[model samples]
Target chain A: NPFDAKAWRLVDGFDDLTDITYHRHVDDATVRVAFNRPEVRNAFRPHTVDELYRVLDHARMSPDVGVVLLTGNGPSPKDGGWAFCSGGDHILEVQRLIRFMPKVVICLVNGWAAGGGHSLHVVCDLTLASREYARFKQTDADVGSFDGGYGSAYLARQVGQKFAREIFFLGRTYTAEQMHQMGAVNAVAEHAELETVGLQWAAEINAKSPQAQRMLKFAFNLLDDGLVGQQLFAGEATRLAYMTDEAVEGRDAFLQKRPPDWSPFPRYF
Target chain B: NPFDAKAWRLVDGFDDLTDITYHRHVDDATVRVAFNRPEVRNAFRPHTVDELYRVLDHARMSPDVGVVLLTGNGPSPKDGGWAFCSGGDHILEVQRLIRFMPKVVICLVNGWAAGGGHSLHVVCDLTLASREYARFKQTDADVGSFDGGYGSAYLARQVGQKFAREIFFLGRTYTAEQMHQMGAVNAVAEHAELETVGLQWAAEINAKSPQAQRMLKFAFNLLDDGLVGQQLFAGEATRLAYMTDEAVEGRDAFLQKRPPDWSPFPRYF
Candidate 1:
């Protein structure tokens, strides 16, 4: 089921990418996303998003590729080392969006996805994190103030409005078990079975008509913003000037290419 | 605070007469919906989509109307009846996208709502059902399956995906108590205070810059669709097609001026 096999790449970003790679199959429509950062516990950062968006976009645009199976790279570790995409770089994509949004995106989260890393996973339409993977705080706000402006309406949708507030505002992390129960993650499986489960979901989605899938995807994208749309319904004044200090810090961290030490901002509410 | 001082009219479709009365409020937006069928639970019938679209088009055109809130008419029997919208004409709305599509375009939840009388209430951005006035589903798939088709995506965004599935897929009617806890309804107050609370929400939204509100509303609407968007997701076409049978029955009953006897569809999943 795994493709004929290919090589992983390492580029500039967070931690060394020892085994990151993308592969295509001879028979199946599904692709696989295996994190190359085993050294950092598959600890993903900015470069990973670029890599991911590239792969996902490639798969989406390809007539041959149907679905994707995302799983961790390297040998399965116990406790602290085992994770899906534990939140890492907080600024990469948000700043990237300032330039232009990516055309295609997909993520197959088979293992841990903590903090900022988890946010990236949520952005994708289909996600199936492993039961063993745990999620954690994504930004510096996790430690102190709520100075985190991790841009991405995707998380805001997966977790719900109030829970989104709690996660971002309070900066708390949850476990795989909690996420599965919450329905944030589509399906969860054991460490060894993560890829198989992900492939199963991929196959199901791949079997559908492409045009239909695109339409349904677009409709849900519409629904995700409805609550925030409620904000516009309130017609509140511009919050641009009042952006939390953490938001500014997040912006700076992305540009600086260093881990952000986000300073907490005064509460707005 | 209350606009009861302004005279209101109940009218059919006409740009002149419609906008004349519909546009009565300059400071705040207005939602003008038909009680539809005053006799049969005031359930909406087939072709009512045109009338609803007319209201939305007018709301979209009017600069004065900042937001629109549409609801069904006739007070409930208090007590067990609960309140809010008692659910829309589920059967008909399910079958016809032409009718169900208006909800995707319009959103004005606060001015008035209770039960599920109109599917549009569920479509609105905000909801403030009376604690005594609202009631979630008392039974499972007992009545019909017209809801969730319109508001499912939005509700999923506001509340998490699973929670949304629970209420929507289950055909659950939320009492004000449950809704407030779930954060589905914005606020729950005394039945008499519903309008007061709703206006407060409207005034808050109306006070903002129109340009900002417009941009935010548009962005948020697109955002709620999620990155892939809901229409682009899946299941709608089949879901709609499946609902046609129920919808036709709903229409025939309305035409005959009698309640349609519907047998709930069996759960496949």
Candidate 2:
């Protein structure tokens, strides 16, 4: 069923599919995200970003879409042939937003995402990639803080300010092995086992109510100043105290082994 | 040399120093410090604390001594030998009160200074170390922080909370290499260069105007929570605002390459 096959283009001049073909599979209640763009290493183009946002929105609203599975189009040069979304389209028209949007996203990076392609990788709350596929980079001089780009701040928050700066300043890229030490990515799996592992991760999150995910996402966003900002705000001890109250209810419920009641506290603290 | 040689023997059991000696020729206007107690592997002991306090005070007050140079007395094991003072004296009668002492402490961590040994290391305004030395315990459980030491809170301020927790949590001591990466130590050099480097660092600090150094230390120490415990109080922000006026004056003076007008600020920022 090559429906709308003409819509996608081959990247790197290879006759491969680039963006994922989003389909709602009823049997598994999963969104099948097939990266059909194989040639040019399936670098995510502008349309691909737009489509991801649309598909995520669809999945969020659809009661039956319990899981979203993203994978590479086919084999590539590195492996048997090659696979996975290699990264973002370096030369494509720069867009205002990424393909994966509505901000609730997950990806199965079966191969690798490099250069401008790390958009969805950072955007996703939980991104499970094949151990062989997790690679990241940023030029040292052009430090950026775009909403979706991890760049300096995200890496700093996850690893550390100095370590993050070292990597970014040197423009050093690392393979999945090195990233594993930093504990940035959720899980790493073998190429053959990636889909199963990714689905398992999706299923784990899927088990929770959609409302919980939304709330958690919102709370995380509200407090995050990214890495550099937090370091700069080192003097804001009072502000830190202010935010501690946000987690109090969640923590109390966690300790009590019960769902948190949504009742508002008289004081934020 | 013989005059102070007798005084050193009384404190021989100390981990910080057993034989306190001065390099007299180069010691003009500089107080030389040595970790003389090779027995017990230069471990910090009770008597060592008082002597250090006394000597450092003498150096600070004596117009003849314009600087202080600190170092240890011996070779280390070729492979991961724990040298220097691993910690402060666990047996000392820990100070009971928090007094805003009036002395500038500079640490020359020539070798490993783990656990309690680092209590003094943390107090120093700047710490220089030998590349071969280890700063904290890399292997011991709990990283030696829970020993009810006096300087734990002070040290935590230099290295951020998360990092401090990690270093102390795992009781995992770090090499000079690791400490450098974490930004804990000011700089690291070859083991053979500790003496020359130590003197140079002290000379550089001493070269500054005594009045300026005194005021700067006072201002910086004000930021320390232990020194100013009432940050949580309502008046704290106002207190900081007051300091900003002085901060501006200081900045302007630096930009203009002139002495800062310290008397103008109404109060501490």
Candidate 3:
């Protein structure tokens, strides 16, 4: 019953979207953002990036949402097969994808994730792939374009330098299991039940303390996120400072399921 | 003959050492730095860290040393078996381990890479473990100590948040294969062939373009090392500035194994 999209309610407004389908899970605090351009197999143009950013920002402000599920819509009869994305289009503010977001983004790869698409998934915190048909690749080197940023460096961080070099240089198509084995993906799911798997994972994550999850995301990204990452963690620390000992008492109580010792600490304000 | 320690010439003036053995592979441009403390299973105290810094600095200055091979000496009759390192010793300046090392670091895990030792290896660029004897673990949380720095966040970066949480919270000992499967380890070798494998890897790395390798290290670490990593990469940029077009001409010739354009732009200084 996890990630049951039947219970997902559509958010109001933005009915004129041209590139993406947006919906929210009413009970699970999860947002499903899927690229809808099946004709071009979900190729992201500049406008697509802009819409993605807007929806992502909207999700950020939405109090109930804690996770964003990214995917691509299916193949229409006249279109190509189910492809995640197909272009090398630029999404300049890379921070919006990983750096600035507090919510976890789980990329659901159903088919081809090539070039910028491949790089986009890599930028997400976690990736789940379809076992049978998902494929990953980079065409930048061969086509004279390049992803010199997160695609290269961060990819190198995930799967050692050798693997990263092979990916960029060879421009080979990697299978789901291959990507999973190489540490680029979090898990591989059955073709028919990929969303169920991701939803289950999201359900588990949604149940955890939101603050803890937020800080944990910052922690996981601290090294690569640079000053912005530190600033985010520090910002949380400042928020904790406002809470002071009350935060610790509450945290302890939450962990131990006991009454908080209310007398030992003074409330600042 | 890749990492054969026989050809390693001892660096002079370290005869007064108390915790580590320092030697360099004269032929392979590799430095073998071993923890000689078998008594407490190679536990690192403050003195050990001090000496590690000194020798590492020496290695940094030594132009001949392209790779630093870190390991622990075997079980002497008075010892508690072979160990890469033990104890929760603090190496506060973690940048020394991975962040700042322009040279490649390959940790040779023989046995009992636990506590701070586990964190130490995690900080290294590549970890090669012995299949039968090597073990990885973290005991900080159990002992009222926590590695909140690179040990936690950076660890999360290497292996996802969930696995890192499990390792830190459970305080369980993981086998070499367990570690490798979780993305924490580069490779595991048979009991008798660990060093040979690591040496082979190092030998291959040593043969590559040093600048590319160095910059690659920066690229891999650019996310986690923050400003310092950026500074290092930028420093290389500045160094390249000194090289100007001549460096590129030489590099092009080396890669193509032919001639250079010989003239393209103005040279500074």
Task: Note the Cα lDDT for every prediction shown.
Answer: 0.48, 0.51, 0.77
Q: Model 1: how far is B96 from its true place, Å? A: 12
Which ten contiguous residues of candidate 2 chain B have the minimum total lDDT?
Answer: B1-10
Whose lDDT is higher: candidate 2's or candidate 3's? 3
Which stretches of candidate 3 lie above 4 Å from their native place?
A1-7, A88-90, A245-269, B1-148, B156-176, B183-269
The residue-level lDDT of candidate 2 at A116 comes to: 48
lDDT at residue B180 of model 2 (Cα atoms): 62
Give model 3's TM-score versus the native structure. 0.56
Candidate 1, position B258, lDDT: 92
Candidate with best DockQ: 1
| Candidate 3 residue lDDT tens string, A1-269 | 12345867777877878898788877788888878887787889888988887787788888888888888877644654767887644385843555568777788888888988888887787788988868899888787898898777878767768888999999999999998877788779986687777777677666656776666667666656678778888887789676776777778888898888888876532
> Candidate 3, B168: how far from true, in Å?
9.0
Question: Per-residue CA lDDT of candidate 1, range B154-186, in tens?
Answer: 566555554454443223345666666555667
Ranking by DockQ: 1, 3, 2
Q: TM-scores for all candidates? A: 0.43, 0.44, 0.56
Which model scores highest in lDDT? 3
Better of 1 and 3 by TM-score: 3
Isolated chain B TM-score per model: 0.60, 0.65, 0.86
